[PDB]
Design a binder for this molecule. Structure first.
Ligand SMILES: Cc1cc(O)ccc1C1=C(c2ccc(O)cc2C)[C@H]2[C@@H](S(=O)(=O)Oc3ccc(O)cc3)C[C@@H]1[S@@]2=O
Ligand SMILES: Cc1cc(O)ccc1C1=C(c2ccc(O)cc2C)[C@H]2[C@@H](S(=O)(=O)Oc3ccc(O)cc3)C[C@@H]1[S@@]2=O
Lengths: 10, 235, 242, 9
C-alpha cells in the first residue's frame, strides 16, 4: 500500500 | 518499446514537452525565517514538486513500459536527486543563490537557520556554478534528469530495457553536442564532464536523506505522508 | 605546471598500470566459523593496510603530485572508500556471487550476514561486479575509472585562486581521451564508444552511493565500540563527518 | 594528521 502506487496509477 | 524508435529530436522534444512547471512557495513576507518556518515552507514545496515529478516520470519515454514495482523502485531511489538537479537548474541564472521558487530566492546565510542545511546548500550552489561555467543547455539538462531517473536505482534491482533506454539518451546527448558544432573530442569530454557531475548529485542526495531522517526523528516539522514514504524507502 | 598534460593515451595507460598496488592477503585463519567481531577485525586490518598502499598509489596518478598537499588530502578523504570498493569489485569480477577481499578471503552474501547491515552493501558490491563482468570491463579501463574517482569525487567541494581545479579537469579530460582511445582500439564504432563511456561513468554514481552507505555503517562501527578501527581509518572516517 | 604525514613522505 503506497501513495506512490496511487499517483503512478492515475 | 516505443521509446527506442524515437529520433534524437523526437526524444528531446518529448522530454522538453514533459517538463514539470515551476511552483511558488506559500507566500507571506515575515522576515527573517526561523528553523521551523523555513522547514515548513520547503517541506510544503518539496511535497508539491514530488507530485509533479511523478507525472513527469510517466512522460519519460519508455518509463511507462516498466512494470509498476520497477517504476516505484526507480522513483524511490532517485526522487531527491531529481528535485536537487531541478533546483540547481533553475538557480543557474542566480549565482550565489538557490531559487527554490520565484518568490523564494535564498542565499547560504539564510540556510543557516536550519540544522546542517548550509552543508547541502553549499554543494547545491557549487553544482549550479559548475553548470553555469559549462553553459549547460536546457536540452542537455532534461537528458541528465531522465538519465538520473533510469540509472540511480538500476543496480539495486535483481534491466536490459532500461539500459537500452539509457543508451538512447546517450546518443541524444551526443546528437545535441554535435549540432552545437563541438568536434568529436569536445563531444566525449563534455559527455563525461556532464555524467561525472551525476556522481556529486548522488552524493548530495545521500547526505540530504540523512538530514531529512534526522528532522523526522527530531519531529520539528511534520513531513507529508508522501515524503515519509519516499524517505522510509531509504532505510 | 606540466607533466600529465603531455601524455599520449598509451602513455597514460602505461603509467596507470605500472602504478597499480598489490593484492594483499588477510590474517584469515580458517577452522571454525568465528564471529562478527573477528570478521570485522580481519576486514578492518585488511582495509587499513590497503589504505597505506592506496596513498602511495595516488602519488603516482598523473597530475596528482601537481596538487597542493591540502588538495591531495581532500581528494583522498573523499574518495578512499570508493577506491577500495572499485578495487574489491574489480578483483572479484571472475568470482560470481562472491567478493574476493583477499586471495585467501573469498566470501558470499551468506557469510556477510555475520555483520549486521553489511549484507546490504554486499549485494550492491556483487551487483557492481556482475555489471563489470557483463560489460567485460578491461584492466586498462578499470585503472582509468579508478583515477577518475580519485580526481573527481572531491573536486566540487573545493574561491579566488581555485583555477587549479581547472588543472584537475584538464587531467580528467585526458583520462576521458584515454578511455575513448582504448575503446576505438577494441573495434568499437563512435556510437559504441560514447555509449560504453557513458555506461562506465554511470557506474561511478552507484559506487558513490555504495561509499556513502558504507561510511554511515563505518561511523556506526566506531560508536558501537565493537571492533577497534585503525587510527588511519578513524582519521579518514572523521573526514566524512566534519 | 596521518594521511598528511604519509602523503608528505
Ligand atoms: C531540493 C529541494 C527541493 C525543494 O523543492 C525543496 C527543498 C529542497 C531541499 C531540501 C528539503 C527541505 C525540506 C524537505 O522537506 C525536503 C527537501 C528536499 C533541503 C535540502 S535536503 O532535503 O536534500 O537535505 C536536508 C534536509 C533537511 C535539513 O535540515 C538539511 C538538509 C536540499 C534542498 S534544502 O537545502
Ligand atoms: C570495500 C572493502 C575493501 C576492503 O579492503 C575491506 C573491507 C571493505 C568493506 C568493508 C569494510 C569492513 C571493515 C572496515 O574497517 C572497512 C571496510 C571498508 C565492509 C563494507 S563498509 O565498511 O563500506 O560498510 C559497512 C561497515 C560496517 C558494517 O557493519 C556494515 C557495512 C564494504 C566492504 S565489506 O562489506
Amino acid at each position: 500500500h503506497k501513495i506512490l502506487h496511487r499517483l503512478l496509477q492515475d | 518499446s516505443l521509446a527506442l524508435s524515437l529520433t534524437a529530436d523526437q526524444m528531446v522534444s518529448a522530454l522538453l514537452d514533459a517538463e514539470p512547471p515551476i511552483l511558488y512557495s506559500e507566500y507571506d513576507p515575515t522576515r527573517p525565517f526561523s528553523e521551523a518556518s523555513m522547514m515548513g515552507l520547503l517541506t510544503n514545496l518539496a511535497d508539491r514538486e514530488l507530485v509533479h515529478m511523478i507525472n513527469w516520470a510517466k512522460r519519460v519515454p519508455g518509463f511507462v513500459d516498466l512494470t509498476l514495482h520497477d517504476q516505484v523502485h526507480l522513483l524511490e531511489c532517485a526522487w531527491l536527486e531529481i528535485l536537487m538537479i531541478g533546483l540547481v537548474w533553475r538557480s543557474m541564472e542566480h549565482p550565489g543563490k538557490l531559487l527554490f521558487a520565484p518568490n523564494l530566492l535564498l542565499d547560504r546565510n539564510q540556510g543557516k537557520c536550519v540544522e546542517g542545511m548550509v552543508e547541502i546548500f553549499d554543494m547545491l550552489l557549487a553544482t549550479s556554478s559548475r553548470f553555469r561555467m559549462m553553459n549547460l543547455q536546457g536540452e542537455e539538462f532534461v537528458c541528465l534528469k531522465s538519465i538520473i531517473l533510469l540509472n540511480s536505482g538500476v543496480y539495486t534491482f535483481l534491466k536490459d530495457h532500461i539500459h537500452r533506454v539509457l543508451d538512447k539518451i546517450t546518443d541524444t546527448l551526443i546528437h545535441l553536442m554535435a549540432k552545437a558544432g563541438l568536434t568529436l573530442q569536445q563531444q566525449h569530454q563534455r559527455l563525461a564532464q556532464l555524467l561525472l557531475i551525476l556522481s556529486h548529485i548522488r552524493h548530495m542526495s545521500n547526505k540530504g536523506m540523512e538530514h531529512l531522517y534526522s528532522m523526522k526523528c527530531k519531529n520539528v516539522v511534520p513531513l507529508s505522508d508522501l515524503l515519509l514514504e519516499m524517505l522510509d524507502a531509504h532505510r
